[PDB]
């Protein structure tokens, strides 16, 4: 305890996406690093670019080790995402703050029992508008999905005027909201 790192409930992997139209979507997805302690998280976060600084067309994804940050994964294919859409003003005011909060919600296991329903999260840096999402494992788990949206919204400090939607990945890959908070 004067010398032991603070362990996380999960080992997490940080992924980076840079668009290269000559490659398949999946091939553009590169593992940055894995970590399983609070100290090791900050070490990685402190040395990497803020999302607000990435070239447009890039993502970060943070996923539980063993879960690939893509629809296709077993843990993702029946799942969906809580989506925060940001406008261009929010890149400045909210993107990096919201992304770090989302990271801390994941590594700290902030959704009680339903943190096991969390797969990971992704930040899309886009010229038309940035997005942050939390991916959950099963769009049919009404109580899980719904408790996660609620706590997450509180964590981001979004006002009651803002409404966020949950979309299944089935729909996204073929988008309507299954739930809002």
């Amino acid at each position: 305890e004067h010398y032991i790192k603070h362990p996380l409930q999960n080992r997490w992997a940080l992924w980076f996406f840079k668009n290269d139209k000559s490659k398949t979507w999946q091939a553009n997805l590169r593992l940055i690093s894995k970590f399983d302690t609070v100290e090791d998280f900050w070490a990685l976060y402190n040395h990497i670019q803020l999302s607000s600084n990435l070239m447009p067309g890039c993502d970060y994804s943070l996923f539980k080790d063993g879960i690939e940050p893509m629809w296709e994964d077993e843990k993702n294919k029946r799942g969906g995402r809580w989506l925060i859409t940001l406008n261009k003003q929010q890149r400045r005011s909210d993107l990096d703050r919201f992304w770090l909060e989302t990271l801390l919600c994941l590594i700290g296991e902030s959704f009680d029992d339903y943190s096991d329903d969390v797969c990971g999260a992704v930040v899309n840096v886009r010229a038309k508008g940035d997005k942050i999402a939390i991916w959950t494992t099963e769009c049919e788990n009404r109580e899980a999905v719904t408790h996660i949206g609620r706590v997450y919204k509180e964590r981001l400090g979004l006002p009651p005027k803002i409404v966020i939607g949950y979309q299944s990945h089935a729909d996204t890959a073929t988008t309507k909201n299954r739930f809002v908070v």
Partner: peptide
């Protein structure tokens, strides 16, 4: 079940 407070995790950043 290992849970961490936002305030605890922030205190660790340096």
């Amino acid at each position: 079940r290992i849970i961490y407070d936002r305030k605890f995790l922030m205190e660790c950043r340096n």
